[PDB]
Amino acid sequence: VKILKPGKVALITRGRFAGKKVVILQAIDQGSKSHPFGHAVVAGVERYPLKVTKSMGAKRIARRSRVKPFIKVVNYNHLMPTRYALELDNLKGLITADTFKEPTQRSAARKTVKKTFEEKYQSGKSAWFFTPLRF
């Protein structure tokens, strides 16, 4: 009955990543001192992979089928929730309210998200997640 919970796919509606699809990692319904509002920790796709066809070469397909992710703390009011949800294998406890305080831990978390998102893109079990929304 709680729309926003870990694993759910949402749409960002405000900020630099407006229109980017994200997966909720943590759902902080109550407000903390930092972010005193109902926020969420999310991982989204900053650059979607490009479409690949059978006429492409092997090296070209590898280039186009790449995901550049982002990690962000977002107010609930800047999220539009969807009905899709992701599986969220090893992105369970790796992005807490402590990796954001350190740019080193930020780049490490993003690299981890990049590997799981990219491997998830290949053998597409969530195709809607990696297709850009056109607007």
Partner: protein, 106 residues
């Protein structure tokens, strides 16, 4: 008291003959010929002036760096923030409705 003259041969109070008074380091009162005021770009959906961008004459925009002429967001510098938000939500909901109408068509 000191009275002034146009510094150009244009003799009429047209919109290209705008002036303001300066006091010089020679204690001289004289005109300074100035341009028309700039304009902030407006949203393509709502017509509102777009935030984060200065008011300049059209060709002055050719001298700014890229980021001064836009906002780091989809349609930045072309749509307002609230217009973009309407577009994202509208696109998503309409696409979902196309999905259900396709599912219920079979």
């Amino acid at each position: 008291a000191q009275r002034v003259t146009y510094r150009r041969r244009l003799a009429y109070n047209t919109r290209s003959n705008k002036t303001r008074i300066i006091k010089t380091p020679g204690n001289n009162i004289r005109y300074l010929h100035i341009k028309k005021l700039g304009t902030i770009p407006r949203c393509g959906d709502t017509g509102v002036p777009l935030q984060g961008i200065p008011a300049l004459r059209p060709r002055e925009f050719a001298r700014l760096s890229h980021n001064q002429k836009k906002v780091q967001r989809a349609y930045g510098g072309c749509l307002s923030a609230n217009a973009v938000k309407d577009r994202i939500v509208r696109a998503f909901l309409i696409e979902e409705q196309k999905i259900v109408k396709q599912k219920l068509k079979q």
